[PDB]
Ligand binder design. Sequence first.
Ligand SMILES: CC(=O)O[C@H]1C[C@@]2(C)[C@H](C[C@@H](O)[C@H]3[C@@]4(C)CC[C@@H](O)[C@@H](C)[C@@H]4CC[C@@]32C)/C1=C(\CCC=C(C)C)C(=O)O
Ligand SMILES: CC(=O)O[C@H]1C[C@@]2(C)[C@H](C[C@@H](O)[C@H]3[C@@]4(C)CC[C@@H](O)[C@@H](C)[C@@H]4CC[C@@]32C)/C1=C(\CCC=C(C)C)C(=O)O
Ligand SMILES: CC(=O)O[C@H]1C[C@@]2(C)[C@H](C[C@@H](O)[C@H]3[C@@]4(C)CC[C@@H](O)[C@H](C)[C@@H]4CC[C@@]32C)/C1=C(\CCC=C(C)C)C(=O)O
Ligand SMILES: [Ca+2]
Lengths: 214, 213, 217
Amino acid sequence: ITGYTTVDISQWHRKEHFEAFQSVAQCTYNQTVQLDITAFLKTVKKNKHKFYPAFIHILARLMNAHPEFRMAMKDGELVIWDSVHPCYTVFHEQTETFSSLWSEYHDDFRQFLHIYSQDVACYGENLAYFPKGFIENMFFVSANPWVSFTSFDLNVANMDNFFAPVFTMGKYYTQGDKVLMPLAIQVHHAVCDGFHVGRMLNELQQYCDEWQGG
Amino acid sequence: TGYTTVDISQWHRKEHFEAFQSVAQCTYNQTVQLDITAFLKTVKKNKHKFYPAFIHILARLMNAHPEFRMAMKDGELVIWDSVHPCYTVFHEQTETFSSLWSEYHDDFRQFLHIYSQDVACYGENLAYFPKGFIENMFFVSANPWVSFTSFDLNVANMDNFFAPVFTMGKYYTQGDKVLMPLAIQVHHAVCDGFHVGRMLNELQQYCDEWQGG
Amino acid sequence: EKKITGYTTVDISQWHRKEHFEAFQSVAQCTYNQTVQLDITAFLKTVKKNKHKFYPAFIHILARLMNAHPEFRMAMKDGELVIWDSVHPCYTVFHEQTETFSSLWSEYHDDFRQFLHIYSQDVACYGENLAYFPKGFIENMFFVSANPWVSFTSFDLNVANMDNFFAPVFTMGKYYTQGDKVLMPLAIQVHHAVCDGFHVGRMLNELQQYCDEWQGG
Ligand SMILES: CC(=O)O[C@H]1C[C@@]2(C)[C@H](C[C@@H](O)[C@H]3[C@@]4(C)CC[C@@H](O)[C@@H](C)[C@@H]4CC[C@@]32C)/C1=C(\CCC=C(C)C)C(=O)O
Ligand SMILES: CC(=O)O[C@H]1C[C@@]2(C)[C@H](C[C@@H](O)[C@H]3[C@@]4(C)CC[C@@H](O)[C@@H](C)[C@@H]4CC[C@@]32C)/C1=C(\CCC=C(C)C)C(=O)O
Ligand SMILES: CC(=O)O[C@H]1C[C@@]2(C)[C@H](C[C@@H](O)[C@H]3[C@@]4(C)CC[C@@H](O)[C@H](C)[C@@H]4CC[C@@]32C)/C1=C(\CCC=C(C)C)C(=O)O
Ligand SMILES: [Ca+2]
């Protein structure tokens, strides 16, 4: 069982937008940014952290900081999960296939890293699409280490109620003194407008710059 | 709204249109890093607002080429005599937005005045569409939080969705230039690489050449 | 003469991707685009010295990669998943005077010369034909379109009907100078049922290699 609360649509300043983005104007949208990871990378090295759980956790912290990232339709109602957990890809080198695992979120990165590294240790070699099953309150992260993309765009055949956010990380590279990571984010318009993604991406850049590991 | 109904039998894109309305139907999104170096310097030196200045160049381009003005009206494909920019207004206090259209005019200064009136009169109204929506719009959306390398719109139902959608990003310095992320979504039935590329080459031009009159 | 190409039926029961393929043909069905600024510095120099047209030459490189890896060569044929023996580039041709376009396929060969002579005939015989598909369409093609107007940082295709749409789509943009490099926008759309991030990335890393290592021969 998982906690949620209910959006009151008749009182919401997005009532009209939600109603249209749920019917005649339904749409999802993707955007890519070359994210500045110079500081964050130095940090992850300084502390001997694995890049990937560290990045997944800053995203998870953001999904867990604004309610527009945690929306679902539940038995006909718009709801906001009290938390969301990251569901991230793991690559199997031998079969050339992937799985998605999810790890329980906590604010303290240290506590999350321990749960993550444990999840990878027990389920990493399990070749199921979803070794742990899937839960209803997650968001997606995938690592695409081969390609320093300028664009990454998802075209999901059925977007009905697909409100979980989907992030895709690209291969970081050098650009003068910086390390730039390509970062794409797909969201559904019924639950995020440009303002939500934009504030999130700004706070993500900032957090990457100011977090001090641990 | 006046229009011209297309003579399909004589149209060189007859088979295209027909494939792009059924079996091959599709939409496509493109982003470019527009160079607004000269455009911005023009805007500041003449104390214009950037957004209506840009909307107006978008809006001249859509009104110079018919592929941007097509629509399906009562089972017939039609070209509008003109199309009117439908642009976003952000409400900082509720963190929501509205989509407002302003009557296009050729002269910039006529346009800026209808735009200023529109935004003064309806800019606090929180309706999704404060003026409702008319048949002949194209869409312009502003995104100044993000200097994106890609913006991509995936509409669930693209049937007869012929109205172009531009999405503007956060401009930035690079070397000595000012670049601005600019994306365009079109439907394949009414525009091909060429029509979108010609358009974008013209945009770049009209920006480097605009005089502020 | 016609070439009817051979194929192999996929035993889905021995395929490591079976669970995925079945999710991505139903509840998770999706497609995805990605764009790269391809580094074409060595390739363009090679092309200029040996006086080739750029397009047929790039198309041939793409063709070689689609024909090096079976995930690019899948199709549903009479209700069954199959790998084509090989696939042929179906590429665009721009008609200046009507401002229209066609899609033309040319039969693939391993050897550039063989291939450049096929492409040149096709382009001379059909280059002016205003038909959407001057040569019709055959069952085992991949797509390439040239988009020489625009140096995009993104291009992506949103197909309304993706069922069984397994043929890769490539889009090339207008090349440009970045310091000493010559870069070219290159985008690829694939269907997730037959390609994962790994397939597509391996391919794009190989495409770069091949572009830098090509000898005009
Ligand atoms: C086919 C389709 O779904 O297009 C939808 C999608 C639409 C192009 C459009 C109206 C407008 O807000 C749009 C904005 C620019 C508004 C602000 C930015 O967020 C966008 C990134 C955004 C994308 C698409 C969009 C959402 C649509 C309309 C027109 C409006 C009509 C009604 C009844 C609400 C539509 O139904 O046609
Ligand atoms: C509506 C839709 O198609 O979303 C689908 C699509 C889905 C978002 C998703 C689960 C997950 O792998 C996804 C990944 C991130 C996984 C890794 C990267 O490759 C991506 C490029 C990728 C894109 C979409 C995707 C494939 C879906 C789910 C969640 C549960 C998965 C299953 C099989 C039930 C879903 O159907 O809800
Ligand atoms: C699944 C789908 O909608 O793919 C459609 C979409 C299609 C891939 C394709 C044939 C071809 O021109 C295409 C081009 C490359 C041609 C030139 C470029 O403009 C585009 C960047 C472009 C995008 C998609 C596209 C339009 C399709 C076909 C091919 C079969 C033949 C006909 C007559 C429709 C199709 O339906 O199979
Ligand atoms: Ca919180």
